[PDB]
From a paper:
HuIgG1 and huIgG1σ differ at position 268 (histidine in huIgG1, alanine in huIgG1σ) in the BC loop, and at positions 330 (alanine in huIgG1, serine in huIgG1σ) and 331 (proline in huIgG1, serine in huIgG1σ) in the FG loop. The huIgG1σ Fc structure includes residues G236-S444 and A235-S444 for chains A and B, respectively, which are only those observed in the electron density map. The lower hinge regions of wild-type huIgG1 structures, including those in complex with FcγRs, show extended conformations while that of huIgG1σ has a kinked conformation at S239. Interestingly, the electron density map for huIgG1σ Fc reveals a deviation from this pattern such that the primary conformation of the BC loop is the flipped-out conformation while that of the FG loop is the wild-type flipped-in conformation. In chain B, density is also present for the flipped-in conformation of the BC loop, and this conformation refined to an occupancy of 40%. The present crystal structure of the huIgG1σ Fc demonstrated the possibility of the coexistence of a flipped-out BC loop and a flipped-in FG loop. A clash between P271 and K326 was avoided by a rigid body displacement rather than conformational flip of the FG loop away from the flipped BC loop. In addition to the deviation in conformations of the BC and FG loops for the huIgG1σ Fc, the structural studies suggest an increased mobility for these two loops that may play a direct role in how this Fc interacts with the FcγRs. The mutant simulations suggest that the A330S P331S mutations in the FG loop are primarily responsible for the increased flexibility of the two loops in huIgG1σ; the H268A mutation in the BC loop has minimal impact.
Numbering used by the authors:
A (entry chain A): 236 to 444
B (entry chain B): 235 to 444
Amino acid sequence: GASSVFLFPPKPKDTLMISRTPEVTCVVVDVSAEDPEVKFNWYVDGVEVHNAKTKPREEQYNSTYRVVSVLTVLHQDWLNGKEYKCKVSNKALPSSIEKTISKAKGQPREPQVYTLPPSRDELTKNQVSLTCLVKGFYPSDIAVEWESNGQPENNYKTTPPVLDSDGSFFLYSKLTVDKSRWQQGNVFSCSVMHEALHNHYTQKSLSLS
Amino acid sequence: AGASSVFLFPPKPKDTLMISRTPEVTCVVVDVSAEDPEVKFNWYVDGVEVHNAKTKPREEQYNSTYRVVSVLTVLHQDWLNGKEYKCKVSNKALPSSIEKTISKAKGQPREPQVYTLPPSRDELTKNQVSLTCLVKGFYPSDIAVEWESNGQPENNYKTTPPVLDSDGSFFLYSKLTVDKSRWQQGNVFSCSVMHEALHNHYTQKSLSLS
Ligand SMILES: *[C@@H]1O[C@H](CO[C@@H]2O[C@@H](C)[C@@H](O)[C@@H](O)[C@@H]2O)[C@@H](O[C@@H]2O[C@H](CO)[C@@H](O[C@@H]3O[C@H](CO[C@H]4O[C@H](CO)[C@@H](O)[C@H](O)[C@@H]4O[C@@H]4O[C@H](CO)[C@@H](O[C@@H]5O[C@H](CO)[C@H](O)[C@H](O)[C@H]5O)[C@H](O)[C@H]4NC(C)=O)[C@@H](O)[C@H](O[C@H]4O[C@H](CO)[C@@H](O)[C@H](O)[C@@H]4O[C@@H]4O[C@H](CO)[C@@H](O)[C@H](O)[C@H]4NC(C)=O)[C@@H]3O)[C@H](O)[C@H]2NC(C)=O)[C@H](O)[C@H]1NC(C)=O
Ligand SMILES: *[C@@H]1O[C@H](CO[C@@H]2O[C@@H](C)[C@@H](O)[C@@H](O)[C@@H]2O)[C@@H](O[C@@H]2O[C@H](CO)[C@@H](O[C@@H]3O[C@H](CO[C@H]4O[C@H](CO)[C@@H](O)[C@H](O)[C@@H]4O[C@@H]4O[C@H](CO)[C@@H](O[C@@H]5O[C@H](CO)[C@H](O)[C@H](O)[C@H]5O)[C@H](O)[C@H]4NC(C)=O)[C@@H](O)[C@H](O[C@H]4O[C@H](CO)[C@@H](O)[C@H](O)[C@@H]4O[C@@H]4O[C@H](CO)[C@@H](O)[C@H](O)[C@H]4NC(C)=O)[C@@H]3O)[C@H](O)[C@H]2NC(C)=O)[C@H](O)[C@H]1NC(C)=O
C-alpha cells in the first residue's frame, strides 16, 4: 500500500523560531487489527537515526489502526536542505514503503510585503477587505498572520503560494473586518515569517488614511 | 482494472461562457499497452449516445506505453444546464469497460464582486509594480480572469486558484505586473472577469494612476 503512508514536513514557523521544535511526521493508516508491530526506519541524508518517537497503534472509528511516528529535526538541518526518509515495514504486506521530504532547492529570495487598503468601491459594504500581498519569495515555505492592537484577527484567508513568471512565489492574504473598525482608525498588521527575511520576520501595517 | 488509467477533463470556464469559443470535454486513456488491441470510446450525454467526438491516434510515451485521447465538443447551454457527460473506454484486453462521468459543479450560483487595487505606496520604489484584482463572493469556483490595456491583452499576470471563503463562496486574486513607468504615465488597465452568474457572463473594472 504505497498510498497508506504519509510524510509531513515541519511547520514553516517551527523551522524559523528558536523557541519552537520542528518535526517531520510519518503517518501510516489502514493497519489491520491482525497485523503485527509496524516498524519505522528513519534516515537523515541516508544515515539511519533512532531518536524518532513512535506512537503505539491507535484504533480508529472505521475499525482500522493508525500509527504515527514523529521525528524532531534540527532547525538548521531542515534549512540547510537535508533529506528526511521514512520507511514503513508492515510484515502483512509484500513491500516496505519509503517516502522522502526536504526543503526545496534553489537560492532563497526575500519576500516583499505590501498591504493594500479596501477598494473605494468596497467601502459601501458592511465588511471590507484588507489585503496583504507577499511576493518574490523562495522557497515557498512561509507563514502569514494578521493582528490588531496586539491581538490576532478572527477572519482571514490566505491563498496558496503561486509560481510567478520569474521563478519566485507570491500569495495574498485577505483579512475581513467590519467597516466600522476600519473607519475608527484601527491599525491592522500583516506579519510574515520566511527564512530569507532578516530575523526571519517582518510586519507591515495598514490603517485608514 | 484500468479504472485508474482513464481521466476525464471538463471544458475551460472561459470556453463555456463565450459562445464564440469551443468548449470540449476530453477523455484521456494512459498506460495503453502495445500488445492491446484498439482502444474504443463511446460518449453519452445524459445517458444518450452521441457520435460527434474526435479521437486522436495513439501517441507513444517514453515509458513504452501509449496515450489515447478522445475530444467531445459540447454545447455551452448544455454544460451550463448541468448535463452529464460520460466517456466509456473499451478494450478487448480488459474484462470490463471503464466509464467516467463529469458535469458542472452544482449548487446555487453567486455573482462575484470585482475590486481593483493600486500598488502599495511602498512598492512605488520598484521598477515593476503590482496591480491587483480581487474577485470575491462567487459560486461555483469556475471562473476566468484576464487583464487588458488599450484593448490589448497584458502579458505578465498570474492568478491565484479559487480559495474557499468563510461563507461558502470563493475568492481569488489576480496580480498584473507592469513597468512602473507605464503606471506613472496614466495608462489605464482593466481586469475582466467571466463567470456564469454575471450578466452576459462578463464584467470588468479599470485601474489607473490617481
Ligand atoms: C479510517 O480512519 C482513518 C482516520 O481518518 C479520519 O477519521 C475519519 C472519522 C474521517 O473523518 C477521515 O476523514 C479522517 O481523516 C483514515 O485515515 C486517513 O486516510 C486518508 C487516506 O485514505 C488520509 O488522506 C490523506 O491525507 C493527506 C493530508 O492529510 C492531512 O490533512 C488532512 C486534512 O486535509 C488531515 O485530516 C490529516 O490528518 C493530515 O493532517 C495533517 O497531519 C500532519 C501530521 O500530524 C500535520 O503535520 C504535523 O503537525 C504537527 C502538529 O500539528 C507538527 O506541526 C508537525 O511538524 C507536522 O509535521 C498537518 O498539520 C496536518 N494538516 C492539516 C491540514 O490538518 C493528503 O495529502 C493525501 O492526499 C495525497 O494522497 C492521496 C492518495 O491517498 C491523493 O489522492 C492526493 O492527490 C495526494 O497525492 C499525493 O500527491 C503528492 C504531490 O502531488 C505526491 O508527492 C504524493 O506521492 C501523492 N500521494 C500518494 C502517492 O499517496 C490523502 O488524502 C488521511 O490523512 C488519514 N487520516 C488520518 C487522521 O490519518 C483511514 O483512511 C480510514 N479508512 C477508511 C475510511 O477506509
Ligand atoms: C507513462 O507516461 C504517461 C505519460 O506521462 C508523460 O510521459 C512520462 C513518460 C513522463 O515523462 C511524464 O512526466 C509525462 O507526463 C503517464 O500518464 C500519466 O498518468 C497519470 C496517472 O498515473 C496521470 O495523472 C493524473 O493527472 C491528472 C491531471 O492531468 C492533467 O494535468 C497534468 C499536469 O499536472 C498533465 O500532465 C495532464 O496531461 C493533464 O493535463 C490536462 O489535460 C487536459 C486534457 O487534454 C486539459 O484539458 C483540456 O484542455 C484543452 C486545451 O489544451 C481544452 O481546454 C479542453 O477543453 C480541456 O478538456 C488540461 O488543460 C490539462 N491540464 C494541465 C494542468 O495541463 C490528475 O487529475 C489525476 O489525479 C486524479 O487521479 C489520481 C489517481 O491516479 C488521484 O490520486 C487524484 O487525487 C485524482 O483523483 C481523481 O479525482 C477526481 C476528482 O478530483 C475524480 O473525479 C476521479 O475519479 C479521480 N481519479 C482517480 C481516483 O483515479 C492524475 O494524477 C497523468 O495525467 C498522465 N499524464 C499524461 C500526460 O496523460 C503514465 O502514468 C506513465 N505510466 C507509467 C506506468 O509510468
